[PDB]
Subunit: 421 residues, 3 copies
């Protein structure tokens, strides 16, 4: 049996008192993680190559994920059964090298480690065939599914309905990778088409976006014993909410009963998204490693409820010895509410001493002792409709109740382990 996974766990304190607190700019879809993670998260994978005969083989893989608040010993939870798929290599004679697979699977996810941000993730129940050799590149095709809560109604008259149902969203993914564009440079192109797929009799409320597209281009350049990846993505309509390749075609639906059922007009995600990203990890000599990110993401919604986000961070690593190093992480976020036009910003500085299994910025396990400082100035926030956060923003100064954190300061510190095996 093959045992693999990922896990992080630790104990922390907030300067002003109590447990460690984590800092994320309101409106931002991520945070700089070093010394800024407040939960124990673990994915335990058990898999096995269940059959092999020549060049043909079947691999079985699973993944059970646990997320607990690390505030006590006994902490009950509802694990997420995230993967359970079979992959058969070389089964299709005329498509030598291709792999066919079916089941829940983390499918070719693309992420930026330091901000724990996935920018291309269509994972979920699915099937497909990958690595079809085209000579000049490798072609992969896949179809996965995600479902939204509600959104499908059996309308009797007008917008009055008898029943609701969860809406399934299908994604059809095509990728071409390994395009040798320049020396030590490679390019991958990808197209994603997603659409809400309603059961017979059910229909989406008026205004639902229903479908959308997403185009991805990623260039990888090998250098300084690492790489640099340049990404450009453009998503449209239904693909803008999740923004990683999954469709949210009924996003914005809602209803109210009085008992007559009324399906409100969908406050949809019609619009577009532009994401220009550049991140990498390289070695500057013998004593220094460096991870960095620079990203501009603009979700332009027709309903004007989007956000313009800029994020920049840097994580240098100084290697005192092969198993001990000092890390520093500095990250800046700036989010402009499309609605109010105001801006929220935050910068966090983290200094950590670390012992790790290897001399790389990528070596894990790692045991860290850190101190984090974050300063933010948030001018807007989402209107907090009593414990519920709304899609609408409002300036903090307006008497309206928002989830804004205002203008403040904080520092935390503690120990933590992180590992992938």
């Amino acid at each position: 049996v093959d045992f693999h996974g990922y896990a992080r766990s630790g104990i922390g304190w907030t300067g002003s008192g109590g447990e460690q607190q984590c800092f994320q700019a309101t409106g931002a879809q991520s945070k700089y993680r070093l010394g800024n993670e407040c939960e124990t998260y673990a994915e335990l994978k058990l898999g096995q190559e269940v059959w092999k005969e020549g060049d043909k083989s079947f691999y079985f893989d699973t993944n059970v994920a646990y997320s607990v608040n690390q505030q006590n010993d006994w902490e009950s939870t509802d694990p997420a059964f995230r993967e359970a798929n079979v992959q058969g290599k070389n089964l299709i004679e005329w498509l030598p090298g291709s792999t066919i697979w079916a089941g829940k699977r983390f499918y070719q996810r693309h992420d930026v480690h330091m901000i724990d941000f996935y920018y291309w993730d269509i994972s979920g129940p699915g099937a497909g065939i990958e690595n079809i050799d085209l000579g000049f590149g490798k072609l992969s095709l896949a179809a996965t599914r995600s479902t939204e809560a509600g959104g499908s109604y059996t309308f009797s008259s007008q917008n009055i309905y008898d029943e609701v149902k969860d809406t399934a969203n299908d994604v059809f993914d095509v990728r071409l990778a390994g395009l040798q564009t320049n020396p030590d440079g490679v390019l991958e192109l990808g197209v994603d088409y997603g659409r809400a797929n309603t059961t017979d009799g059910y229909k989406l409320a008026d205004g639902a976006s229903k479908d959308g597209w997403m185009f991805t281009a990623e260039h990888t350049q090998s250098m300084l014993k690492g790489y640099n990846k340049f990404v450009v993505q453009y998503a449209t309509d239904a693909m803008t909410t999740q923004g990683k390749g999954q469709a949210r075609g009924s996003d914005g639906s809602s209803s109210f009963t009085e008992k007559i059922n009324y399906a409100n007009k969908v406050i949809n995600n019609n619009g577009n998204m532009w994401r220009i990203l550049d991140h990498g990890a390289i070695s500057l000599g013998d004593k220094w490693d460096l991870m960095y990110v620079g990203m501009y993401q603009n979700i332009d919604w027709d309903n004007n409820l989007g956000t313009e986000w800029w994020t920049v961070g840097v994580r240098p690593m100084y290697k005192w010895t092969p198993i001990m190093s000092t890390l520093l992480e500095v990250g800046y976020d700036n989010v402009k509410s499309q609605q109010t036009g105001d801006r929220n910003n935050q910068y966090k500085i983290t200094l950590a001493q670390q012992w790790q299994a290897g001399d790389s910025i990528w070596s894990r396990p790692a045991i860290r002792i850190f101190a984090t400082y974050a300063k933010w100035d948030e001018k807007w926030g989402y209107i907090k409709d009593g414990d519920n956060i709304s899609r609408y923003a409002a300036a903090t100064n307006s008497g309206i109740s928002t989830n804004s954190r205002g203008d403040s300061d904080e520092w935390t510190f503690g120990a933590q382990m992180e590992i992938w095996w």
Copy 2:
């Protein structure tokens, strides 16, 4: 560590729209599974032979089951802790070869793969001693437990009660197997006695069946590189509800509070059940494998709320190559309501292309692409008491609301993997 288990997961679509739908005749206790399974189910077993000294050994085994709807990546669930037992082989000197065990265990379950129907399953918390050598056969004794919700009351003044409690049902199982009846033929006999076992002070509402018997006879004939099993079972009263060997002695109990507590008269399971079954898996030459089922099951309840069920199916497998085949599954169900006398029927046809690790109809893992068509005509259904399904049936045409599917058609298609390791 020994890693074993079972798992199935896939993605599907319904011809008329949305996610895949699964077809099962109302009243039938099963459905023809090929291309007719709508969930990701997995059993992860981790066990180990923890001690061995000569012919003696102790094996530890566990089993954690997960069932998710495969409609998203992150799907939280409450896993079922189904097995955790220890088996000691050859510990009893005077009963050489016998195995003593205790703990939660899937005890000698008998099922028909194609319809995923267990017809002899007393699994649960238990203990026993198996494989006592009698020379002419092997004898096994076991006691397991199951518990029903409520059913036990502390009656103050006739049927008015102070407290309720869950009712434990004990089953005492005796099996004699390996009776060589004819060349390549073997016979196994089994007796099961089950009963509701109330705590002191508590009593079952008046009318409860309390106990029952079940007798099983199974003949196995080895042939055509497979087998054919002929099964005859007769169950009595408390053994008719679950109908696989577990007792439901307080089945039908209910109560209402107004606060005075009244235990209604138990609408019991007094009656009998007859099940005549024949299933098998054989090889017809080099290119063909075949699984088949034929079953008649009649639950005759004194109160007349039972069902008479006929099911017939066939699953031929044509082997294009050792790792690629085409499967066809045709299944028919006919269920007569004992109450109304009406009949429900359905036939489903499934065509699937498959790649599997081996050239057997039993080889797993397997990756399938299928198309399923089902036609049904249901004349009756259980009276749907608003989201709640009742024990009482009603003709679909009667203005009464039932869970009947009417007269209709549907087809689905998709990909799926299934594996046992």
Copy 3:
């Protein structure tokens, strides 16, 4: 992958009827476990030495716990993710041999097996450095966390508050072990300081204890192919509720809303605890092994709601053969309510036949068949505030409703397995 853990599961019956019942004296913090365990409990640990280079290494360890009532086959549950930590050995050059670790961990727990009583357990999310060699002993430092529900409020005016929050309690642990006090005798000293650590803006209700201390001294004497441990422990204030090293600084807090929020007067745990314990396991010749416990524990609370507890038990084991033995367990408990002055007592006698993997009282797996008898006479009980048990006690004879079991008798019997691997 290293597979380890603990598990117990079985089936039982109560003489007077129904499922097995378990006997624990009201007021007592434990019960004599042999043939007195009513659930299936299992801890599945999967770990691995993920890196090794010379004398340095990193070990990754996990632990997922399951507790089910063993009353049916399919029993859903919410597993507890109890451990997830990394330990790096020999990473600190100047502290040779020391191990640094971080993550959720069962940290150096001290318990008495026969009563399943942990008397020194600060397990939970934490970090620390253990086994610092001082020459004359080993020094270990650790900080772990536990959190109480509520207890932290944002007071606006008087005991009126706007928001509540869970209260984190930090423990700072220091231990010195391996003090060679006499031939074959060793002594370990330990100090624990814990305190509720409130978030800025929040405060504990008035009356809360906030912090406390605990001092432990444990002497181990090796003899009769076993040992004898003598323990003396003294705890103060916040350390008295859990009483094993974890702090409960806001213990007793409560509130009521009418919507104005009022934080009641904390009915605190101010006071002290004295625990004098002696337990061991030794071999008396070839055919006899013996486990024993003798403990006096007195929780003296300022508010007089404490208890004075005496427990004594013995478990001899007669070895018929190397893999078969007969066990007897006799345990007595006596608990005096500090409030009422009344006493509750119970004695349970257990006779069990056992097959185990080894000839030790410590050998596991083990399969047992037992018969248990318990007699109790409880004069007091906690005031049962309708399903809810209060901190206040009342004599059974007083017309007040308490959770007292009165004066009675009961016997149970069944089979069970227990294993640690």
